[PDB]
Each structure stands twice: as C-alpha cells, then as structure tokens.
Amino acid sequence: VKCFNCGKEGHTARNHRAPRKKGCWKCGKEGHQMKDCTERQ
Ligand SMILES: [Zn+2]
Ligand SMILES: [Zn+2]
DSSP: EEETTTSSSSOTSSSOOSSOOOOSSSOOOOOSOTTTTOOOO
C-alpha cells in the first residue's frame, strides 16, 4: 500500500530490511556487490 522506500507494496515504509550493502560485502567498494566481486586471493 505504501512501500516506496524499496519498490513493492505492503511495507508502507515500515518493512525495509538491509541484508546486503549495495557495494561489495568484503572488498569495500560500490558499483558491484559481493556476488560480482570474486575476492578469492
Ligand atoms: Zn520494501
Ligand atoms: Zn569488491
């Protein structure tokens, strides 16, 4: 009904979780994410 802070319907700006961090979750850089960045070393 008002999920505008995410892109859905039912959250009403009161159910927006944040498991990922947009950028990589280990290397520390935006643009890509933990799925795109390999970081195998
Ligand atoms: Zn949402
Ligand atoms: Zn990265």
